[PDB]
Ligand binder design. Structure first.
Ligand code: HEC
Length: 86
């Protein structure tokens, strides 16, 4: 997958709710590494799944994003989390 492209996908599709790796509307569930771990989301497969089909009422992106773009934003998210969202 492509982290750098994922940044772009993230800015257009995720950052409204997850700016800075945070969660503007549900502060308990951010994209920081510790919160991803807590919720069993610290993996590309988990993130892809969440974003694709959107369960837990999460926005679903299958309609508007290609698989490859979903893979890309997931790798982006994991990279950022590892870097503590800079
Ligand atoms: C609001 C309109 C959102 C947009 C757009 C996206 N996300 Fe989101 N995300 C949102 C909420 C309200 C929650 C918490 C409830 C839940 O379903 O988990 C989340 C959570 C996530 C998580 C899990 C974070 C954690 O458990 O700590 C991930 C990994 C996630 N969101 C990823 C993500 C991505 C990649 C997005 C764009 C493609 C995206 N979200 C958009 C709300 C909203």
């Amino acid at each position: 997958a492509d982290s750098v492209n994922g940044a772009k996908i993230f800015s257009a599709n995720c950052a409204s709710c997850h700016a800075g790796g945070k969660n503007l509307v549900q502060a308990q569930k951010t994209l920081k590494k510790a919160d991803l771990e807590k919720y069993g989301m610290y993996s590309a497969e988990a993130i892809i799944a969440q974003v694709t089909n959107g369960k837990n009422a999460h926005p679903a992106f299958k309609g508007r994003l290609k698989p490859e773009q979903i893979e890309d934003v997931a790798a982006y998210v994991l990279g950022k989390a590892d870097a503590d969202w800079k």
